[PDB]
Amino acid sequence: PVAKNGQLSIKGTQLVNRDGKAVQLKGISSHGLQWYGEYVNKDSLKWLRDDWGITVFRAAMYTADGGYIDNPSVKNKVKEAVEAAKELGIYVIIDWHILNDGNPNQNKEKAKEFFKEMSSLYGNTPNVIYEIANEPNGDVNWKRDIKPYAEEVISVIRKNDPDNIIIVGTGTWSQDVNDAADDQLKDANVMYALHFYAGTHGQFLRDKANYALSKGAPIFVTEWGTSDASGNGGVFLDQSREWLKYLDSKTISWVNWNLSDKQESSSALKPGASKTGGWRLSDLSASGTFVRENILG
């Protein structure tokens, strides 16, 4: 809804629009663009905007696993997704989707080059949200590994884009927002990622988030699923409601994982569902049906 909200900014912990009103963005993430980028096009995004009401779309560009590092032509899919979002007036998250490569320092030079290119192209576009490191994991912690990565990537972005929102992943697959909160970045327009799976993470993770907010650290849910953390194991609707009620209570934006026909509980679509949208309810999974309901409201 950027044609409505325009330039985003941060008031305290609260994401606000260009009028200065609080906004809660809701949407869905691609699966890895090198495998399911076939579902990410102007058509499908327009159908998501119109039929699901998404106000944000996430372009999950894996670095490892046949992603950008081995095949950088996938960056054309991210550009495709950003141009679709500009046409359609929705926010787009450019997600440098580290995972197997758990320390963001591992692909740091390529990250900085990639974000220099994206910020250069899209830096004066209000649609764009940068996610610089999906899920730091392994022996990887905030003060030692992630913050100093973040500073370097943020300096390069800010040369081209002084004001769009940058979201920074946190330790333990973006759970340890408490540690970021203890040693925050100075950037005015920075938020910290939190990720949960309704089948796995309960109150300890909410506690961490409330603690981070209490320190003034903004939180954005760039990825959450209705399944357990493997992305499979069925759909946990009661826990997913509990979690969404918690995010509503703090007005926290969220993006569900994932838009694809991957045969696991967390995929939104059944196999055979159109790459260009127009899905009926009977074309959506249990998870997709629930998610679309909650994006609509």
From Swiss-Prot:
A GO biological-process term: glucan catabolic process
Catalytic activity: Endohydrolysis of (1->4)-beta-D-glucosidic linkages in cellulose, lichenin and cereal beta-D-glucans
Keyword Hydrolase set for record: yes
Active site per the UniProt annotation: 135 (proton donor), 223 (nucleophile)
Domain of life: Bacteria
UniProt: substrate binding residues: 31, 35-36, 62, 97, 197, 229-230, 257, 262-264
Keyword terms, alphabetized: Carbohydrate metabolism, Cellulose degradation, Glycosidase, Hydrolase, Polysaccharide degradation, Signal
Group of enzyme by EC: hydrolase
Keyword Glycoprotein: no
EC number(s) per entry: 3.2.1.4
A molecular function GO annotation: cellulose binding
Family per record: Belongs to the glycosyl hydrolase 5 (cellulase A) family.
Protein name: Endoglucanase
Full-length numbering of the shown residues: 35 to 331 of 499
